[PDB]
């Protein structure tokens, strides 16, 4: 009664307590979800209405552990605020309880800021692609100065040649660069296709630098001289492969033919990602 409604209304006060206090805390880690969640009343959220909702493949920033059943964090999305996240055991328990009444881990740890990776317009290690990507890296360096780190990744991180240890340490380095929520951009030599990082926990923002016309790409390659035109076919084949991918495999597609327009598009996207990852106080 109000015998009981002493404790189970002081619990709600003590929960709202921690929740406001975590608003200022740093992000402990991020996860990419493999499942969706929307709270039902019977889920017994420490503060009613304060559970977050998400779909599979969303990203969550986790601040702290409230108890064994609930974490505190936010959906990485503009406007979304701190709330309760069900822990994996709580998700399992809801399923099990649901089955009883009627009678694949849910989270992957990923960097707190998704690393930006550029693919296209063709293969890296040739002039057209390396130079076009270089101009983009240089733009970002100044456009996001003070909020960004751009780093070369020579080790073959798609292997998660390069030893296992060398790959693991580069992966750990990328996680660390993102820990304080600055933008992270990789110049990753070996990555030419989005499917190359799909099995890692890097969860990149994949930027497709796309030349719409194969004729245009061929002419660009030829403009580099016969030392590059010797390798025309392998570059043309690779660009055609990117062009066959469904657009949803890419987070950003830069098909603008002017550097400044491609830069503005990418900057607008990353500025919005900055907002999604840095909620107002």
């Amino acid at each position: 009664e109000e015998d009981r409604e002493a404790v189970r209304r002081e619990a709600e006060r003590q929960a709202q307590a921690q929740l406001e206090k975590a608003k200022t805390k740093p992000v402990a880690f991020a996860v990419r979800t493999n499942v969706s969640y929307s709270a039902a009343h019977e889920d017994d959220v420490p503060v009613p209405g304060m559970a977050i909702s998400f779909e599979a493949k969303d990203f969550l920033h986790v601040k702290e552990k409230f108890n064994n059943d609930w974490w505190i964090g936010r959906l990485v999305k503009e406007g979304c605020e701190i709330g309760f996240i069900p822990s994996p055991v709580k998700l399992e328990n809801m399923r099990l309880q649901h089955e009883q009444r009627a009678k694949t881990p849910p989270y992957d740890v990923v960097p707190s800021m998704r690393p930006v990776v550029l693919v296209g317009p063709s293969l890296k290690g040739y002039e057209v692609t390396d130079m076009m990507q270089k101009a983009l890296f240089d733009f970002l360096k100044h456009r996001f100065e003070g909020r960004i780190s751009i780093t070369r990744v020579t080790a073959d991180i798609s292997l998660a040649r390069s030893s296992l240890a060398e790959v693991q340490s580069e992966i750990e380095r990328i996680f660390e660069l993102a820990r304080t929520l600055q933008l992270v951009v990789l110049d990753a030599d070996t990555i030419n296709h989005p499917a190359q990082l799909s099995k890692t926990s890097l969860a990149p923002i994949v930027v497709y630098v796309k030349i719409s016309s194969p004729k245009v790409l061929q002419r660009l390659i030829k403009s580099r001289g016969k030392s590059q035109a010797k390798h025309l076919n392998v570059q043309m084949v690779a660009a055609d492969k990117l062009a066959q991918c469904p657009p949803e495999l890419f987070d950003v597609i830069l098909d603008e033919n002017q550097l400044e327009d491609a830069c503005e598009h990418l900057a607008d996207y990353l500025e919005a990602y900055w907002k999604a990852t840095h909620p107002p106080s």
Binding site: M131, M132, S213, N257
Partner: peptide
């Protein structure tokens, strides 16, 4: 003089000039 082919051709000229300029901007960094 198929007009569609004419504007396509002009679009490809613009694309090429744009990308050539893009590459040049990378070269002088």
């Amino acid at each position: 003089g198929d007009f569609q082919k004419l504007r396509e051709k002009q679009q490809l000229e613009e694309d090429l000039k744009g990308y050539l300029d893009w590459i040049t901007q990378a070269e002088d960094i």
